[PDB]
Amino acid sequence: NRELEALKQRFWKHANEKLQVLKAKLQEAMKLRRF
């Protein structure tokens, strides 16, 4: 299945609601501040 996985890799090479994402990635920085 290595060639099929290589085709998947080529496909992903060409491959290129958000408040919670913002809050999580910001809360990481606040955790760093606390530490």
Q: Taking CB under 8 A as the criterion, which residues in 1-35 touch another protein?
A: 10-11, 14-16, 18-19, 22-23, 26-27, 29-30, 33-34
How many Å apart are CA 1 and CA 18, to the nearest integer? 36
Pick between residue 6 and residue 27 the one whose CB is nearest to another protein.
27
Pick between residue 1 and residue 22 the one whose CB is nearest to another protein.
22
Q: Which residues of 5-28 are buried (b: 16+ CB within 10 A; e: fewer)?
A: eeeeeeeeeeeeeeeeeeeeeeee
How far is Cα of residue 21 from the mean position of the Cα atoms in its chain?
11
Binding-site ranges for another protein (CB under 8 A): 10-11, 14-16, 18-19, 22-23, 26-27, 29-30, 33-34
